[PDB]
């Protein structure tokens, strides 16, 4: 399962100005095999079914 990740309040996790690999380790502990700074947030690829990811409608910030 692919998607961006979202930080403790349901936004999406920013990468701007992260070091490269930053979205990879926040994903790799999410449990995703790679994941990338899609400017500006991290993308995830590899979640198993039952992670939740940022989906628009319930978006906050």
Same mark, same amino acid.
């Given at each position: ?8 309040? /349901? ?8 070091? %490269? $690999? !930053? #979205? /990879? ?8 095999? %790679? $994941? !990338? #700074? ?24």
């Amino acid at each position: 399962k692919e998607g961006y990740l979202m930080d403790h309040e /349901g936004c999406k996790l920013s990468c701007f100005i992260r070091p %490269s $690999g !930053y #979205c /990879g380790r926040e994903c790799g502990i999410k449990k995703g095999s %790679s $994941g !990338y #700074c899609a400017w500006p947030a991290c993308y995830c690829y590899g979640l198993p079914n039952w992670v939740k990811v940022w989906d628009r409608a319930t978006n906050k910030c």
